[PDB]
Design a protein around this ligand. Structure first.
Ligand SMILES: CC1=C(/C=C/C(C)=C/C=C/C(C)=C/CO)C(C)(C)CCC1
Length: 175
């Protein structure tokens, strides 16, 4: 009975790019297939005068070969018919880092305390997601209230990703 079709998923009402800007610490994540950011993940969102959203992000990634690096990533966002759904083109400062073009959906946020992001990289034939990732972001890296945790858990259920997230440390690795 829970609808896990990606096209069914609610996203943030009247999403406000400018209010979303600034520093977001990734507290928890659900991983996609393949190489991905591991931890010490901090994103910096910005919006220019014409409404164009972009971000930088830092995080540790371990290459296929056990080589740990601090990835310095860049993303530029293209707006769509839904103000909370973007296409994110991304690349690294280092040429060997992954480049791509991912959906970037703001599932929920209160702008001042938390955000839940989501990306489906591949649909199954039934419209559910075959390869997703999701970040839970915080403005404050010390933690969420129990009240905010409750809401985040709900959103995670709504994305059919409950119990699939891991907590992410911050330990200064990338500076
Ligand atoms: C750009 C960008 C994001 C995604 C980064 C990704 C997907 C990084 C992957 C790096 C890899 C796999 C490095 C190893 O080559 C998030 C969603 C955090 C929002 C802020 C801007």
């Amino acid at each position: 009975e829970r609808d896990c079709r990606v096209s069914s998923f609610r996203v943030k009402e009247n999403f406000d790019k400018a209010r979303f800007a600034g520093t977001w610490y990734a507290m928890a994540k659900k991983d996609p297939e393949g190489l991905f950011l591991q931890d010490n993940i901090v994103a910096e969102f910005s919006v220019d005068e014409n409404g164009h959203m972009s971000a930088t992000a830092k995080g540790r990634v371990r290459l296929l070969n056990n080589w740990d690096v601090c990835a310095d990533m860049v993303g530029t966002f293209t707006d769509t018919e839904d103000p909370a759904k973007f296409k994110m083109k991304y690349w690294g400062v280092a040429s060997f880092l992954q480049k791509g073009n991912d959906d970037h959906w703001i599932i929920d946020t209160d702008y001042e305390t938390f955000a839940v992001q989501y990306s489906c990289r591949l649909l199954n034939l039934d419209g559910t997601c075959a390869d997703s990732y999701s970040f839970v972001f915080a403005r404050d890296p010390s933690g969420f209230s129990p009240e905010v945790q409750k809401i985040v858990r709900q959103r995670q259920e709504e994305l059919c990703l409950a119990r699939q997230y891991r907590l992410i440390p911050h330990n200064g690795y990338c500076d």
